């Protein structure tokens, strides 16, 4: 029904659960890519839920940009492209930034998740 409900059911490759949710949220593409629209969706959701103030947009989108740039570069290093692991690695990198409040981030994603089918 709700993404997490549906992803957890699906994987019951457990790591893939994370990518699963993120594609439903629209934070990651269905081919594992992160591009402008993904970055738009992610940054917007964070702001609309107040996790980050809108006076920070350029710089929030900046970390997501450089994180994307960085995951791809590490993926090419290992001679492969984006995958379940890179989807997890993208969140990690994004959560290392001081802009985001971990508890606040988590609850936002949990709230935003409740607003989706299926």
């Amino acid at each position: 029904e709700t993404p997490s409900q549906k992803c957890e059911e699906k994987y019951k490759r457990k790591a893939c659960i994370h990518h699963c949710k993120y594609q439903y949220y629209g934070f990651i593409d269905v081919n594992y890519n992160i591009a402008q629209p993904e970055i738009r969706k992610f940054s917007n959701v964070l702001m609309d839920y107040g996790v980050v103030d809108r006076s920070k947009k350029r710089e929030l989108k900046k970390v997501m940009h450089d994180c994307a740039k960085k995951i791809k570069k590490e993926a090419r290093t290992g001679d492969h492209w984006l995958n379940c692991r890179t989807s997890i690695d993208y969140y990690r990198c994004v959560l290392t930034s001081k802009l985001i409040g971990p508890q606040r981030f988590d609850k936002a994603i949990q709230d935003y998740d409740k607003t989706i089918s299926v």
Side-chain angles (χ1 to χ4, degrees), residues 22-23 25-29 34 38 41-42 45 90 109 112:
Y22 271 37
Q23 63 145 28
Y25 303 156
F27 304 153
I28 303 185
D29 217 324
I34 287 93
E38 286 70 58
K41 179 79 173 171
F42 204 5
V45 169
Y90 174 75
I109 289 329
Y112 173 71

Side-chain angles (χ1 to χ4, degrees), residues 17-33:
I17 289 183
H18 169 81
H19 173 69
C20 188
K21 296 160 175 174
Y22 271 37
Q23 63 145 28
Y24 281 134
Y25 303 156
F27 304 153
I28 303 185
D29 217 324
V30 308
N31 52 3
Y32 296 102
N33 196 39

Side-chain angles (χ1 to χ4, degrees), residues 35-87:
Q36 292 174 335
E38 286 70 58
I39 289 174
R40 184 184 329 137
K41 179 79 173 171
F42 204 5
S43 70
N44 291 1
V45 169
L46 283 196
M47 292 172 165
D48 288 332
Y49 279 73
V51 183
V52 189
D53 304 343
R54 309 175 184 275
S55 75
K56 299 283 213 313
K57 183 197 186 94
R58 185 185 286 158
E59 78 210 82
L60 173 61
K61 285 168 60 196
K62 186 52 185 166
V63 329
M64 302 192 178
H65 178 254
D66 285 329
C67 281
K69 185 176 163 209
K70 181 180 171 71
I71 306 297
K72 293 163 188 165
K73 186 180 181 177
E74 306 167 1
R76 291 276 187 88
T77 281
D79 188 12
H80 65 83
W81 195 233
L82 301 183
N83 53 26
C84 282
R85 182 54 55 182
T86 62
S87 292

